[PDB]
Swiss-Prot record, chain A:
Protein's name in the database: Transcriptional regulator LsrR
Alphabetically ordered keywords of this record: Activator, Cytoplasm, DNA-binding, Repressor, Transcription, Transcription regulation
Subcellular location: Cytoplasm
Stated consequence of mutating Q145A: Moderate decrease in affinity for phospho-AI-2
GO molecular function, one term: carbohydrate binding
One GO cellular component, as annotated: cytosol
UniProt keyword Lipoprotein, yes or no: no
Annotated knockout phenotype: Deletion of the gene causes a significant increase in expression of the lsr operon and results in accelerated removal of AI-2 from extracellular fluids. Deletion of the gene affects the expression of a number of genes associated with attachment, defense and pathogenicity. It also affects sRNA expression.
One GO biological process term: regulation of DNA-templated transcription initiation
Regulation of catalytic or functional activity: Inactivated by phosphorylated autoinducer-2 (phospho-AI-2). Phospho-AI-2 acts by binding to LsrR, which is then unable to bind to the promoter regions, allowing the transcription of the target genes. Phospho-AI-2 triggers the disassembly of the tetramer into dimers and reduces the DNA binding ability of LsrR. Dihydroxyacetone phosphate (DHAP) may act as an anti-inducer and inhibit binding of phospho-AI-2 to LsrR, preventing induction of transcription of the lsr operon.
Induction entry: Autorepressed. Part of the lsrRK operon, which is positively regulated by cyclic AMP-cyclic AMP receptor protein (cAMP-CRP) in the absence of glucose and negatively regulated by LsrR.
Length: 247, 248
């Protein structure tokens, strides 16, 4: 319904490997989890390793994917710290499920503390495992969401921080790393050296990296994520796909 | 004379416990401990109360038996220790209505200064406060006598050389990685103690009901010391262990 054509155009414009565009009406957050869970069911082979990001679209996707995770013995690994944030999509599975979790906060209070935690063995071990995954699933945050962004509502940055990240040219983020409209990570940003998880440069080792995000206010962030290479597959909705293509 | 019901009463009066269950020593030990211990916690937890959960085999076994109850009675759970991952056997199996509060840190830091830094991060401190405020705790008890079989060795939280020195220094057992001597006092000069991130035993004692779940005759000295120090005020154990504790 224009969805096949959007998929084709996004695929070619951003040189993607896989794309799914969901129709334009009741539950978009929810049909996005379904769309992405389907895409993951078709990419993942039994016993493969899935690296999981933070936030609402990803947790929604994981809840929907749980019987597939058990049935196919998929191994999960956290791309980010914070632990507890993942209990909604993990308080959800079974004890035979291998779940590999970074045992640290998502963001440390100083960059020196982030570097110390990243060198602890039990942390370093999981960071390697995550970079070795077969597929990644991640959300995409947008500066233009303002107070509605997950990163603000969770408390991981302050409003003052968000304002300055915007002033500095960032349009969006993956895993708390903010990039400009061309897709380059923005240089001068305190949270980037405080985060404990895998940097975006390392996420790119994973061969299939699926972003799941929608809402027209995310269109610029999603375009820039693709231009930067962070994701090479996308699950989004029809209005957002339109907006992305005109960006 | 005697039997399990007599050991229960005697353990209760000798160590001033609030609750005790001794399961008969016939099938599967750790499995039946798990079941005994879940029934005990099913009697103690009122709806929407908070349970603080320790580390190791008997606690994880217990939690698994407790899931239906945890979900149906809306029990909130909070980790007494760091380490995060170890905790996914027993809480793995729970609805998403389940409030599970987890210390977002390793179980043991590589240095005391790193442990002090992590305890002071806000997301860590907040959970350490919630844990200390729990209504009921469930912990296991480790013993120096178990040597290579001790969960603490098998999981790699201490080395063999550490264990030998801990024993040379007079320790008999541990709760949450903290090693105490035969009278129930924490042994003072032990490196792991200042590298652990979770709640110290002094703070564990704020929780009003503290259930230890442990079995095997090699643990009898550790379990007795644990009660003498006051760390647990309730016990789930097996018949032979109970008999050994009593002749301790
Ligand atoms: C890492 C976290 C602090 C921020 C983050 O991951 C995000 O990239 O901002 C992510 O939350 C966006 O996804 P949604 O929560 O689905 O909007
Ligand atoms: C904190 C952990 C490293 C050690 C610990 O808690 C413990 O007390 O030794 C515990 O493992 C003993 O319980 P069991 O594993 O059931 O024998």
């Amino acid at each position: 319904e224009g969805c096949l054509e959007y998929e084709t155009q996004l695929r070619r414009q951003f040189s993607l490997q896989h794309v799914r565009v969901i129709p334009g009406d009741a539950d978009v957050g929810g049909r996005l989890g379904i769309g992405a869970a389907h895409m993951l069911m078709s990419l993942l082979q039994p016993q493969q390793m899935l690296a999981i990001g933070f936030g609402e679209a990803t947790m929604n996707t994981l809840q929907r994917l749980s019987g597939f995770i058990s049935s196919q013995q998929i191994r999960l690994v956290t791309l980010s710290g914070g632990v507890g944030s993942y209990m909604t999509g993990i308080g959800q599975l079974n004890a035979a499920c291998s779940v590999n979790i970074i045992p640290a906060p998502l963001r440390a209070s100083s960059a020196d503390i982030a570097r110390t935690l990243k060198n602890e063995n039990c942390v370093k071990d999981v960071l390697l495992a995550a970079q070795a995954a077969d597929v990644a699933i991640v959300g995409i945050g947008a500066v233009s969401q303002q107070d509605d962004a997950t990163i603000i509502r969770s408390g991981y940055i302050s409003q003052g921080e968000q304002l300055m990240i915007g002033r500095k040219g960032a349009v969006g983020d993956i895993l708390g790393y903010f990039f400009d409209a061309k897709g380059d990570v923005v240089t001068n940003i305190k949270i980037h050296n405080e985060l404990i998880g895998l940097p975006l440069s390392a996420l790119k080792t994973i061969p299939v990296r699926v972003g799941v995000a929608g809402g027209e206010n995310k269109a610029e962030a999603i375009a820039a994520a693709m231009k930067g290479g962070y994701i090479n597959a996308l699950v989004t909705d029809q209005d957002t796909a339109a907006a992305i293509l005109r960006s």
